[PDB]
């Protein structure tokens with residue numbers, strides 16, 4: 518029945534000083550303070566009987582103006598055994614579809630559609646079909662070109678995945694993007710599996726269409742359900758993370774759902790948000806100490 522709050526900074530802007538952590542724990546009449554990573558993350562056991570909304574407000578006020586995330590959850594079952602993570606803008610820094618659109622000279626036009634889709638102003642499937650249509654005729658060679666030159670991994674990604682695997686979790690990269698990208702990215706980072714949409718080609722060029730049925734918001738929910746059943750758990754045993762509206766289904770279903778640097782309307786709908794930390798934040802959310810990490 519007991520609660521814990523966790524404060525989390527970005528390791529590249531590690532502002533959670535010892536004095537700040539004590540101030541915060543004092544602000545909630547805390548029963549102790551445990552450092553998971555110096556200047557980066559600490560656990561604050563909530564005294565019994567405090568509603569979690571109270572502590573979230575109290576901690577956010579004390580920390581106001583500092584780049585430090587606040588999450589509150591029950592201490593039991595906070596370490597999860599399934600990771601399901603979006604790719605674009607979550608484990609990589611880019612949108613694979615916007616990068617491809619550059620090679621058709623249409624980056625800005627396509628990127629504006631992507632922003633509306635990720636904010637939830639347009640359904641994923643029509644938005645994908647509209648953007649992919651504009652890639653018609655691009656040579657297949659363009660995929661390796663984009664991957665090799667413009668895709669970069671998000672900080673903390675490999676450590677999150679490898680540390681969770683080290684502790685026996687099953688990890689999946691589940692994306693509205695393209696298998697030609699996820700297959701490479703997933704093995705770069707170290708996921709157990711990936712699942713994404715598929716660009717159709719004629720053997721030499723992109724046709725400008727995607728294999729149906731398109732995997733969208735509900736497909737991520739279904740894949741989370743499929744994974745939990747196959748490994749003999751439930752979605753409650755999963756942590757899900759993404760930035761876009763098409764991730765809200767899995768974020769809401771999972772036992773721990775994280776809106777990570779999410780679009781404005783997306784973050785508004787998430788129970789748990791990380792706006793300053795990098796992907797290592799999900800390790801601290803789960804109670805890992807830096808000593809546990811795969812370094």
Ligand SMILES: N[C@@H](CCP(=O)(O)O)C(=O)O
Pocket residue numbers: 603604605606612614631634635645691692693694695761763
């Ligand atoms: N963000 C991309 C979908 C790929 P993702 O699900 O983020 O890995 C898009 O708007 O088409």
Ligand SMILES: [Mg+2]
Pocket residue numbers: 603604605606607759760761
């Ligand atoms: Mg995304």
